[PDB]
Design a protein around this ligand. Structure first.
Ligand SMILES: *[C@@H]1O[C@H](CO[C@@H]2O[C@@H](C)[C@@H](O)[C@@H](O)[C@@H]2O)[C@@H](O[C@@H]2O[C@H](CO)[C@@H](O)[C@H](O)[C@H]2NC(C)=O)[C@H](O)[C@H]1NC(C)=O
Ligand SMILES: *[C@@H]1O[C@H](CO[C@@H]2O[C@@H](C)[C@@H](O)[C@@H](O)[C@@H]2O)[C@@H](O[C@@H]2O[C@H](CO)[C@@H](O)[C@H](O)[C@H]2NC(C)=O)[C@H](O)[C@H]1NC(C)=O
Ligand code: HI6
Ligand code: HI6
Ligand code: NAG
Ligand code: NAG
Ligand code: UCJ
Ligand code: UCJ
Lengths: 530, 533
């Protein structure tokens, strides 16, 4: 029996497993329960701390994936299946995972906490691309990841009600962070040095923990990759959240009293809720999600945009960034004329139709303003330019400009901000070439997946992965990604400097789509208000 | 005794002209031909009545008076502004036209160019040195005609619906002159079946309005619009705001001591011309540049609809048009109001002055509209660079008032049956007195079209003289054939798709695409939708 794999946390004793990496072994503790199972009468409720157990919990394998939709658009295609659940679905899914060096550190080691994305409707800490073993070995950190409830199970809200208060998926996240403060030292982690990082909706979650004071005392630094809490998709108002909750009840046969409605919802099998999620959205769209964080004055006392504009952020360091082609990948899920299997060279009619799906629920004037800004009026009908322009519409509106607004406001209000654009297209990427560097495909390099010898990454790509892990770990340890080489300067509201990340050395550039984002961040909001 | 070449009989009676020397030889000039009864006293604000026939010989031997108008005094003595000021006495007796013809007079019918001067509809005169027709006629053997038309309140004060001041009488002055050309130009050797209108700024807007007014449209065959268009935001006014401006002007001068229109105009008729001129600008609703108090009114008569509606719903098959602008249309207007601008310093403005200048350059729009403008003309990587802000504000005024109205006209006319040719004039004259940051200012291609560099008393470059000759041939080729090209780089027609135009400078012709297409898409396609919602 290996004493390195035995740990006592506050709930009781755990048994881990030793794993192999190309650089040596690490210790993993997978499937640690941090909450009571949110089942039966506990569905839709805030999580409760896991009650202590006797005996030894087997922490040698990943636990169940929270109930969620499973993408079936390209069945068997590696580009989509890499994001689908790789374990059984269950409502009993509130488990977290700890990777540490082997033997376990005996000095307080910086902690990285990963929050997966997936539009608040999907995701799992057990996916291959989130394997913490390489970061922990290469950079000598403790890495924690948790499962949190998605879809209606995590974000169905009847605001004002006690039976479905909303944001419980975020509270699952907060509870795991409290678990880390109380327990991570038992694994050799330093609770006074916790860096949150997440991608997409995970980045938005990180941003929301930055703006919720009860969360702010649980971590020290933040990394937001391709997501932001001020995204048009990341939050929903109380009125619309109530409408969506009520509509889903009607769709699954529950008439239409909040108490009656949640009680009837709790009798439905989880899969039934999943099957009807999607039909509560008001219009055809891409990059919008049914059940997302609700601004009800509690977890978020105001909208993230209002909280960002009014916040003092001195003493905060954040790392934020984007991939080169944020929108390209969302277009195959609803923009007319698009497909992974052809060049998606669309007509102007399809482009104009794509703008309404990509910018849903706005006035015709707002839509025409988008068309004006993203049309080259010397080549208004060129299919290649139109495909690229629609990809830029979706990417700028949902990712690049929300991230750029966040970066600019925090920098100008006291935070030290580092910005990147990930510009390397993996040699193993199965998506077509016209998609460029699609959303989500920097994660595998951050986690050091290319070091896995059973994968087909090149030698320079492995070096690149090691470069990225060092930047991320430098930031986690000091608030500065630079090795203490061409220096990575902080992002500021004036100079707007960022670096491009690829196989070539660092190149400093100015402006995160400055011209496009002035439209989304400065003008379009005022058009909608008047 | 008498030179038979300088004696002509038109319908009103006999005329005596003058023989002018040019660098290339003799030209016959008939200057100051009366074409209307003097619009004075009881005829103030009325449409022009045709000139009654006369006995004996009228001496048409010098330029007649300039129509009463404001005289610019911003830079007194500065030639850059004095060249546009009246060079004859001011008078309400000013409805005279000028005819230049080859010496000897042509024996076969000769194409006719008719010039309409600009000046924001408040100023201008056919007698300005820069409009001297002797060089075009000598170089290209055409007949050139120019007329005076009433400006300011005298030409465009409108109490719509009233008979005592119907408005647009300045445009009727132009129309009467065009009717005179049809009835009389053959007596000078001109061909009334080949008349080409050309004009600049408000003259270009005037030319476009004659295109859109059926009674005028039968009086000419081709059109040249230089740095102006009838659909410009400054070129027309609605009936209500025209009535408000007329009523306020009357109130400012003492009329009435105004319900009844007859009575109010009668009181206006007793006021000295200069007093009307002195108060004319006080009726503008706001502090602005490129906006003019009294301008053509859309009242259903001369223009049955707005020029933009008539342009869109018009069939222009069989019509040839030549349109263009200078490289820096807006820079010249900024020293007349924009904060921080002057011809005597570099006018490197701050961001606050840029934002203040936008409201002056784009007057009377919602704050939302103003901020759409700020968004499109800000470089968000260099939001406060003074030199970039100076150029941005110049582009705002130039795009909004000239380039984009011209581009919209060129595009709609091309797509609806007209053959269009477009240019951008990019030569900065060696004799230019305005500062270097202004580039090629508004109005400073005219002297090259009229061949002014060929005057030996002026110190133009020898290369600029060749340039002038090249431009006069383009214009005259268009007047003769509807095509500026010679019967050598080809000047392609402008179309709504390819949007090709040529650059005019000392270099050979260069074909380019798009008359500030991205900018004009904002002014021509989006901004009107915002002003509606
Ligand atoms: C690119 O593909 C889209 C999607 O069509 C599907 O995928 C193709 C690869 C092929 O397998 C098709 O048979 C599939 O239907 C095309 O858009 C569709 O076009 C068809 C007409 O053939 C039409 O009936 C569908 O409604 C269209 N659907 C969408 C979402 O646009 C598109 O035309 C292709 N572009 C090309 C070939 O240039
Ligand atoms: C550039 O000049 C403008 C115009 O001012 C006039 O011309 C100058 C050369 C100088 O002789 C001034 O005294 C003239 O009045 C300047 O803008 C003016 O500034 C003064 C005082 O600062 C102010 O009272 C006026 O209202 C301003 N006029 C306008 C139209 O804004 C400007 O400051 C000069 N810029 C420099 C010198 O950098
Ligand atoms: N619960 C659902 O029914 C459901 C279905 C589909 N989607 C989204 O489609 C899957 N998807 C998967 C991967 C990338 C994008 C997308 C679409 N985004 O709008 C969300 C929820
Ligand atoms: N009738 C008048 O009093 C009057 C006063 C001022 N202006 C304008 O003169 C300024 N100005 C003079 C020359 C060229 C442009 C400009 C400005 N245009 O906005 C016209 C008429
Ligand atoms: C034409 C009109 O209605 N306006 C009146 C007119 O009838 C009247 O003759 C005149 C007397 O001065 O005053 C004015
Ligand atoms: C330049 O022009 C002026 C007037 O246009 C003239 O008096 C002068 O002789 C010319 N030449 C020189 C060298 O100044
Ligand atoms: C949908 C996922 C992949 O992107 P984010 C919005 O979470
Ligand atoms: C003021 C004059 C030069 O401009 P145009 C509009 O006539």
């Amino acid at each position: 029996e290996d004493a390195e794999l035995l740990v006592t946390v506050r709930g009781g004793r755990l048994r881990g497993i030793r794993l192999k990496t190309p650089g040596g072994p690490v210790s993993a503790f997978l499937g640690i329960p941090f909450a009571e199972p949110p089942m039966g009468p506990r569905r839709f409720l805030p999580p409760e701390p896991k009650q202590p157990w006797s005996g030894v919990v087997d922490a040698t394998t990943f636990q169940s994936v929270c109930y969620q939709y499973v993408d079936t658009l390209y069945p068997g295609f590696e580009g989509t299946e890499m994001w689908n659940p790789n374990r059984e679905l269950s409502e009993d899914c509130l488990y977290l995972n700890v990777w540490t060096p082997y033997p376990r550190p005996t000095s307080p080691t910086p902690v990285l906490v990963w929050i997966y994305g997936g539009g608040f409707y999907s995701g799992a800490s057990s996916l291959d691309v989130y394997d913490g073993r390489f970061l922990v070995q290469a950079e000598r950190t403790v890495l924690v990841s948790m499962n949190y409830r998605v879809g209606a199970f995590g974000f169905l809200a009847l605001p004002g009600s006690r039976e479905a208060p909303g944001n419980v998926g975020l509270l699952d996240q907060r509870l795991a962070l409290q678990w880390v403060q109380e327990n991570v030292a038992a694994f050799g982690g330093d609770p006074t040095s916790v860096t949150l990082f997440g991608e997409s909706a995970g980045a938005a979650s990180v941003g929301m923990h930055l703006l919720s004071p009860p969360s702010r005392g649980l971590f020290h630094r933040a990394v937001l990759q391709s997501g932001a809490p001020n995204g048009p998709w990341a939050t929903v108002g109380m009125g619309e959240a109530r409408r969506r909750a009520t509509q889903l009840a009607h769709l699954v046969g529950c008439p239409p009293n909040d108490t009656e409605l949640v009680a009837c919802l709790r009798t439905r099998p989880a899969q039934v809720l999943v099957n009807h999620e999607w039909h509560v959205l008001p219009q055809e769209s891409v990059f919008r999600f049914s059940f997302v964080p609700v601004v009800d004055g509690d977890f978020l006392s105001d909208t993230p945009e209002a909280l960002i504009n009014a916040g003092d952020f001195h003493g905060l360091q954040v790392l934020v960034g984007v991939v080169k082609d944020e929108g390209s990948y969302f277009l195959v899920y609803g923009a007319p004329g698009f497909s992974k299997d052809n060049e998606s060279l669309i007509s102007r009619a399809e482009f104009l139709a794509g703008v309404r799906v990509g910018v849903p629920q706005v006035s015709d004037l707002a839509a025409e303003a988008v068309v004006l800004h993203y049309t080259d009026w010397l080549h208004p009908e060129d299919p290649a330019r139109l495909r690229e322009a629609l990809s830029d519409v979706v990417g700028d509106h949902n990712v690049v400009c929300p991230v750029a607004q966040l970066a600019g406001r925090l920098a100008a209000q006291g935070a030290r901000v580092y910005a990147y654009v990930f510009e390397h297209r993996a040699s193993t990427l199965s998506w077509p070439l016209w998609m460029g560097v699609p959303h989500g495909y920097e994660i595998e390099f951050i986690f050091g997946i290319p070091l896995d010898p059973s994968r087909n990454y090149t030698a320079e790509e492995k070096i690149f992965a090691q470069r990225l892990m060092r930047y991320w770990a430098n930031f986690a340890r000091t608030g500065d990604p630079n090795e203490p080489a061409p220096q990575w300067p902080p992002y500021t509201a004036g100079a707007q400097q960022y670096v491009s990340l690829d196989l070539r050395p660092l190149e400093v550039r100015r402006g995160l789509r400055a011209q496009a984002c002035a439209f989304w961040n400065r003008f379009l909001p005022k058009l909608l208000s008047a």
